[PDB]
Design a protein around this ligand. Structure first.
Ligand code: MG
Ligand code: MG
Ligand code: MG
Ligand code: MG
Ligand code: MG
Ligand code: MG
Ligand code: MG
Ligand code: MG
Ligand code: ZN
Lengths: 150, 87, 184, 129, 208, 81
RNA sequence: CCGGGCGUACUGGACCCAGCCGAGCCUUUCCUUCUGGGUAGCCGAACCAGGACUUUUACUUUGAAAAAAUUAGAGUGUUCAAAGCAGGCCUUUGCUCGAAUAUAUUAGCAUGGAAUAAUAGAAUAGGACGUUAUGGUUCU
């Protein structure tokens, strides 16, 4: 495991066997959707909306209640971001490292980490082009990356 | 093993382990044959009348012979609630 | 008018006659006007009882689920020695052959595996399934085991045997229902 | 990564049978694994086995009775013509009178003796004896 | 199965706990895990003496199956068990091996005390490792009094008990002798009090 | 141990296992109904909450995220749902 | 199961135990068709022969094809044999078994099957059916 490390950690979530909403859950499939859109306009990514839902609203899974996954609901309401969230945070981290590197030119460790992040961007961007999430001519440019995320 | 006419051309049909069903070889000197006496309703051991189990030398070497007898004897009624299937 | 089928049988009319009688008490009346069903399949189970299967349009299933716990109890009173279950009439689409002409991609809800799992879920409605196991016996036959939650167990705990034969009638396979966490 | 779940399943069975255990847990499950186990069960090399549904690939618990000498996969699943089945049984099986080479044919998964009976051939899948 | 007269009586249970038989070693091996009932908060492991009793009854039934009583060999390298095995041999007719076990007694057929027992009974697998090792060379089954740290290799019948107790060793040996004679019919029934006292079979220091 | 019931593990030993190493993996977390001391308003809070949840009535932090389970503030009582 | 020297092949006779290789029909499961035969029974599949469509493979069965010589192999007293494709009959104004059969194998061709491994499909619906659904725009 760990594509870009020697780690073998297994920590992750373990979904319950039950695919139905808990008996104590009382919100409707609608009230969750308006809650998601309300939070989506505040700028939260699908990961953060799901964290807030279970943390403060008791929504264990948006799928077991609404019937669709969170990103599927946003894309159905024209609220899907242009760049996928995970690709956005990889590019944003690469932007931060590249900005740090120009002021710290002897930081050869940051140069090594930057190659890993950018290699991770290209593998993910290439995948998104085959599934037609990104345009076939979409290419990640290091020079113009700051425009996309900043 | 027998031929076409049905005669048992096999010599030495070997014994098999009671725990693992492995064949106990002719020179497996770690293998034993447990003989356990039958007890009548008076609490007396019945002379020359036994329950017999065989263990291969492999099972005994790993130290699992004791736990295998606990299981085998409990299924035959020689023991009660000493070996548990679920751990 | 309650029956969504042309030429209903006498049993369907009697059941719909009950359906036009449970709204008399206003605690459950605001919801029995739209309720309809397609068929009433009935089979004989051992012990002198008879299994009554009410078939419901799948889109109408979630409306029945809101009052099904109550509605069955009075329907079991009106028809004695009857075990009442509510099933949705899901459609099974056959697996396309290699030479078969291309059709629209078959949704998973229309697959035979999903439908048998779905009717296996509608059978035990008040309880929820917490685990399923399939035994493969040396004889060649295969037996399913479904484990049910102890919550709301009293609604089904005296039946289950009706479900096993009813499931066998519908699919031809063997299933055994067990509630591992009872008080016992 | 995990490239052959059948190889993982048979390796676990072999390790449990060689160590004298009468049961083994297999993860993940698949159709090929279940149909491979059914052939082993049909010839008496294993006992009853149980499938556990976890809303995932699944798990299997197999009961071993000590009659199994070795089961294994052939990776890759080579194409086998009918005239090549004889050569494969010579290399993989201990004798001409027992043991089975498992094939996947368009008529289904079956042992090499059944494949000759119905005159079908496919890709080799494994063996058991 | 077994008549209820063979169940663990309260009298024997009182003896086992007063002799500290139930005290098993701090660290338990994986093979002795089923015999542990619960770990005592100091660290000692409590032996399920109900399981201990049944193994004793099972062990005595194997001993009773040996035709020649002298063919049963009872062994003890610990000083705490030397008196027990010598008295066991006297009462049952078995062959006692107290103290040092000469290596080659089972394999070397020109040694002085070269024996061919049909069964070997061991006080402790750790301090009697030599006696157990040779039994695995000439197809001799082994019954062993095992603590929670005692090894279980080449041991067929394990009696879970405290191997490191002065009274534990003597009591277990006394119980086997009584049961073997009960099955043989020497003791008329399972309720008659035995003449021999568990104080006999106990090791005595040179002081007295 | 050569023979063992893998299909019916002891529930005591089954609970000591890692959450991914059970027969069917199951989360050990749960959701709670939190009563702040100041007022009485049902607020569903995840046991391992990563957010400083505040009740709607008064903007007071109910819990602080930690490495594992969220830590409830003083005067806050929880009941598992 | 009368076997008319284990013999036991032959074969009247299985009455088929089970097992094995099949084929359909029913279970929510049908080449959407089109044109007749042709119409028989309802209130075009009732089987053919002449048309219209078709997700792409890999794989595997069977068939045709892969020249003869060579190889394996059936027959045949070249005096045996290596070989050869001869030869055999009561002795012939002639009669007459033959000169087999297997193997080829990647590529190509036709074919049965659909496990295994890919592939395509209904997502801003520009999606599917209306067999005789209602119009409109073009085109043959
Ligand atoms: Mg890992
Ligand atoms: Mg890598
Ligand atoms: Mg993850
Ligand atoms: Mg009313
Ligand atoms: Mg069998
Ligand atoms: Mg070879
Ligand atoms: Mg063979
Ligand atoms: Mg075999
Ligand atoms: Zn508050």
């Amino acid at each position: 495991g760990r594509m870009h490390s020697s780690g073998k950690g297994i920590s992750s979530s373990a979904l319950p066997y039950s695919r139905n909403a808990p008996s104590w859950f009382k919100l409707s499939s609608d009230d969750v959707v308006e809650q998601i859109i309300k939070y989506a306009r505040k700028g939260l990514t699908p990961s953060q909306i799901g964290v807030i839902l279970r943390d403060a609203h008791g929504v264990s899974q948006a799928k077991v209640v609404t019937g669709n996954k969170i990103l599927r609901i946003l894309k159905s309401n024209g609220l899907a971001p242009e760049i996928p969230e995970d690709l956005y945070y990889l590019i944003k981290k690469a932007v931060s490292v590249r900005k740090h590197l120009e002021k710290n030119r002897k930081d050869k460790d940051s140069k090594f980490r930057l190659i890993l992040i950018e290699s991770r961007i290209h593998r993910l961007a290439r995948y998104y082009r085959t599934v037609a999430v990104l345009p076939p001519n979409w290419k990640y440019e290091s020079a113009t990356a700051s425009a996309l995320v900043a | 093993m027998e031929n076409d006419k049905g005669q048992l051309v096999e010599l030495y049909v070997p014994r098999k382990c009671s725990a693992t069903n492995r064949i106990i070889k002719a020179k497996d000197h770690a293998s034993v044959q447990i003989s356990i006496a039958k007890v009548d309703e008076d609490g007396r051991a019945i002379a020359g009348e036994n329950i017999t189990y065989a263990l291969s030398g492999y099972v005994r070497g790993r130290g699992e012979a004791d736990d295998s007898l606990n299981r085998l004897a409990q299924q035959d009624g020689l023991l009660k609630n000493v070996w548990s299937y679920s751990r | 008018s309650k029956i969504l089928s042309e030429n209903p049988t006498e049993l369907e009319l009697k059941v719909a006659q009950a359906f036009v009688d449970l709204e008399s008490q206003a605690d459950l009346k605001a919801e029995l006007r739209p309720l309809q069903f397609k068929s009433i399949k009935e089979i004989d189970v051992n012990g002198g009882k008879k299994a009554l299967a009410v078939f419901v349009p799948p889109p109408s299933l979630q409306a029945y689920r809101k009052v099904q716990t109550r509605l069955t109890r009075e329907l079991e009173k009106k028809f004695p020695d009857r075990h009442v279950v509510f099933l949705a009439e899901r459609r099974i689409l056959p697996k396309p052959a290699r030479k078969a002409r291309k059709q629209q991609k078959r949704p998973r809800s229309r697959t035979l595996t999903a439908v048998h799992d779905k009717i296996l879920e509608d059978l035990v409605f008040p309880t929820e399934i917490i685990g399923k196991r399939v035994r493969y016996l040396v004889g060649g036959n295969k037996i399913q085991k479904v484990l049910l939650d102890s919550k709301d167990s009293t609604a089904v705990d005296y039946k289950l045997d009706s479900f096993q034969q009813l499931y066998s009638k519908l699919t031809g396979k063997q299933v055994v229902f067990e509630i591992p966490g009872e008080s016992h | 990564t995990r490239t052959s779940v059948l190889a993982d399943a048979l390796n676990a069975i072999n390790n449990a049978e060689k160590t004298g255990k009468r049961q083994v847990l297999i993860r993940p499950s698949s159709k090929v694994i279940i149909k491979f186990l059914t052939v082993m069960q049909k010839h008496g090399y294993i006992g009853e086995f149980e499938y556990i549904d976890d809303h995932r690939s699944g798990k299997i618990v197999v009961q071993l009775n000590g009659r199994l000498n070795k089961c294994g996969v052939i990776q890759p699943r080579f194409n086998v013509k009918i005239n090549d089945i004889e050569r494969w049984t010579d290399n993989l099986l201990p004798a001409r009178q027992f043991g089975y080479v498992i094939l996947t044919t368009s008529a289904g998964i079956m042992d090499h003796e059944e494949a000759r009976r119905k005159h079908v051939s496919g890709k080799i899948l494994g063996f058991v004896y | 199965s077994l008549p209820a007269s063979f169940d663990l009586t309260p009298e024997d249970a009182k003896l086992l706990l007063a002799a500290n038989v139930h005290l098993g070693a701090k660290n338990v091996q994986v093979h002795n895990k089923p015999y542990v009932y619960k770990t005592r908060p100091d660290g000692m492991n409590i032996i399920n003496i109900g399981k201990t009793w049944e193994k004793i009854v099972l062990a005595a039934r194997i001993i009773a199956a040996v035709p020649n009583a002298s063919d049963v060999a009872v062994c003890s390298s610990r000083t705490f068990g030397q008196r027990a095995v010598l008295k066991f041999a006297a009462h049952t007719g078995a062959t006692a091996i107290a103290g040092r076990f000469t290596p080659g007694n089972f394999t070397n057929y020109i040694t002085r005390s070269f024996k061919e027992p049909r069964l070997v009974v061991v006080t402790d697998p750790r301090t009697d490792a030599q006696a157990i090792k040779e039994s695995s060379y000439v197809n001799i089954p082994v019954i062993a009094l095992t603590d929670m740290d005692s090894p279980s290799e080449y041991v067929d019948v394990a009696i879970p008990c405290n191997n490191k107790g002065k009274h534990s060793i003597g009591l277990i040996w006394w119980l086997l002798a009584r049961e073997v004679l009960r099955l043989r019919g020497i003791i008329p029934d399972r309720t008659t009090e035995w003449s021999v006292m568990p104080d006999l079979y106990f090791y005595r220091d040179p002081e007295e | 141990v050569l023979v063992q019931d893998l299909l019916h593990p002891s529930p005591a030993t089954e609970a000591k296992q890692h959450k991914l190493k059970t027969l069917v993996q199951q989360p050990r977390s749960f959701f709670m109904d939190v009563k702040c001391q100041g007022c009485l308003n049902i607020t569903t809070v995840f046991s391992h909450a990563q957010t400083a949840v505040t009740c709607d009535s008064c903007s007071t932090v109910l819990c602080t995220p930690t490495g594992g389970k969220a830590k409830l503030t003083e005067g806050c009582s929880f009941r598992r749902k």
